[PDB]
Structure 1
Amino acid sequence: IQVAHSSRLANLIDYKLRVLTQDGRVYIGQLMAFDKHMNLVLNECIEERVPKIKVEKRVLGLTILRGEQILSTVVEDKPL
């Protein structure tokens, strides 16, 4: 995985982002929009859930992820 040395979250808009959540699920998708309270809009979102063995996958689409439930956000890939 490769990515530019970014300064802020707003500066890396429309990059393919992995997003970890408190329940255990991993939402991968392109960051369309952000919030003051870390709510993320994701372009072509895919939920990856790991039950207690192997990654179970679910395609979503346009999604509004709330900030409360997010643990952290990793850059999966660049735009396009």
Structure 2
Amino acid sequence: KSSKMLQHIDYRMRCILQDGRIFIGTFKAFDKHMNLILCDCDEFRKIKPKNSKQAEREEKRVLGLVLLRGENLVSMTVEGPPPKD
């Protein structure tokens, strides 16, 4: 089917980098190498929150429109549904 990536397209996605960073953005495009296009993308370092009572967000950075090279990608999970816009 080839769909396994195409399914998650347009969705908000949590992507894990090889150094251990967390990139969360809107998954808009990919390719053979898994180079990824991430709209409205932010970077997290310390945590991926599961409602951490102290705070959910530390070392968050707004990046914006991001192209990530697939070499440095480890994994991806669904973070939230597509924004309608």
Shorter-normalised TM-score: what interval? 0.7 to 0.9
TM-score (ref. length: structure 2): 0.78
- Which of the numbers 66, 70, 80 marks the counterpart of 2:73? 70
Distance (whole Å) between structure 1 residues aligned to residue 58 and residue 15 of structure 2: 15
Aligned CA-pair RMSD = 1.7
In our comparison, the structure showing a higher alpha carbon Rg is: 2
- Which of the numbers 20, 27, 34 marks the counterpart of 1:31? 27
Report the number of matched residues: 72
Distance (whole Å) between structure 2 residues aligned to residue 75 and residue 26 of structure 1: 13
- Which of the numbers 54, 59, 67 marks the counterpart of 1:56? 59
TM-score (ref. length: structure 1): 0.82
Identity %: 54
User: Offset of 1:11 from its aligned partner?
Assistant: 2.1
In structure 1, the gaps of 5 or more residues are: 1-6
More helix by share: 2
- Which of the numbers 2, 5, 8 marks the counterpart of 1:9? 5
Post-superposition, which runs of at least 4 consecutive aligned residues in structure 1 deviate over 2 A?
none
More strand by share: 1
